[PDB]
From a paper:
HPCA or hippocalcin, is a member of the neuronal calcium sensor (NCS) protein family and is highly expressed in hippocampal pyramidal CA1 neurons, in particular in their dendrites. It contains four EF-hands out of which only three are capable of binding calcium. In response to increased intracellular calcium, hippocalcin undergoes a conformational change and translocates from the cytosol to cellular membranes through a Ca2+/myristoyl switch mechanism. The extrusion of the myristoyl-containing hydrophobic N-terminus region from the hydrophobic pocket allows hippocalcin to localize to membranes where it can interact with downstream targets.
The structure of hippocalcin is similar to all NCS proteins and contains 4 EF-hands (helix-loop-helix motifs) and 10 α-helices. As many NCS proteins, hippocalcin has two lobes, N-lobe is formed by EF-1 and EF-2, while C-lobe is formed by EF-3 and EF-4. Electron density revealed three calcium ions in EF-2, EF-3 and EF-4 binding sites in all structures. Cryptic EF-hand 1 did not bind any calcium ions, as expected. The crystal structure contained two copies of hippocalcin in the asymmetric unit connected by insertion of C-terminal helix of chain E (residues 181–190) into the hydrophobic groove of chain A. This packing is facilitated by salt bridge between guanidinium group of Arg181 and carboxyl group of Asp37, and hydrogen bond between OE1 Gln184 and NE1 Trp30. Interestingly, the same fragment is expected to be involved in target binding. However, comparison of hippocalcin crystal structure with neurocalcin delta and NCS-1 revealed a different orientation of the C-terminus part of the protein. In NCS-1 the C-terminal tail appears to be able to sit in the hydrophobic groove in the absence of ligand and there is evidence to show that this tail acts as an auto-regulatory mechanism to control target binding; it is not clear at this stage if the C-terminal tail of hippocalcin serves the same function but it also sits in the hydrophobic groove in observed crystal packing. Equilibrium calcium-binding titrations showed that hippocalcin has a high affinity for calcium binding (Kd = 65 nM) with positive cooperativity (n = 1.4) as observed for other NCS proteins such as VILIP-1 (37), recoverin and neurocalcin delta. We demonstrated that hippocalcin oligomerises upon calcium binding with molar masses consistent with dimers, trimers and tetramers.
Numbering used by the authors: 6 to 189
Write the structure that this text describes.
């Protein structure tokens, strides 16, 4: 019930957690999920702490699929800690790559319109009960309407990775973050 030296090392290489933190996380993850596999229903219960279960469920399924890199139906500790590390301590570039893999539902390497609207509908449903939204990006259709007409360079009905990454950096919260670049 400690990571084997060889696995510990492999995870220190593929994450931004220290040994102690990986050790602590493995203990916790096992203590909370004695099987060492986290399924969809379990994951939705994690999300339901933060937002009503029924509301968050469709977003929680989309995220679960992004964590589940081999797409077998469950998240093992490697898949979980890696995915957590990227999203919580990753570089902004690779955060947004990970978000792109999520938005791109068929995995053809292009965010289609009906792919975008799906995810945004789920994000809006999850938060509907607590967040009050802007006004112009304040229905999913309204929001999705903004994105493509701020992001679709050629207007090929699709968003490539490159159109997405750049587009997102105007997201107001990313505009806040860039003012903290330690390259003053
Ligand atoms: Ca899996
Ligand atoms: Ca696609
Ligand atoms: Ca395009």
């Amino acid at each position: 019930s400690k990571l084997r030296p060889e696995m510990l090392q492999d995870l220190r290489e593929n994450t931004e957690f220290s040994e102690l933190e990986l050790q602590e996380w493995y203990k916790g993850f096992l203590k909370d999920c004695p099987t060492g596999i986290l399924n969809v229903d379990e994951f939705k219960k994690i999300y339901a702490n933060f937002f009503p279960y029924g509301d968050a469920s469709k977003f929680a399924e989309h995220v679960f699929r992004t964590f589940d890199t081999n797409s077998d139906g469950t998240i093992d500790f490697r898949e979980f800690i890696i995915a957590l590390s990227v999203t919580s301590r990753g570089r902004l570039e690779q955060k947004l790559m990970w978000a792109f893999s999520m938005y791109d539902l068929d995995g053809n390497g292009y965010i289609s319109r009906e792919e975008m609207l799906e995810i945004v509908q789920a994000i809006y449903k999850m938060v509907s009960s607590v967040m009050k939204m802007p006004e112009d990006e304040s229905t999913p259709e309204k929001r999705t309407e903004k994105i493509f007409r701020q992001m679709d360079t050629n207007n090929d009905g699709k968003l490539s990775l490159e159109e997405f990454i750049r587009g997102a950096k105007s997201d107001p919260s990313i505009v806040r973050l860039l003012q903290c670049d330690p390259s003053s």
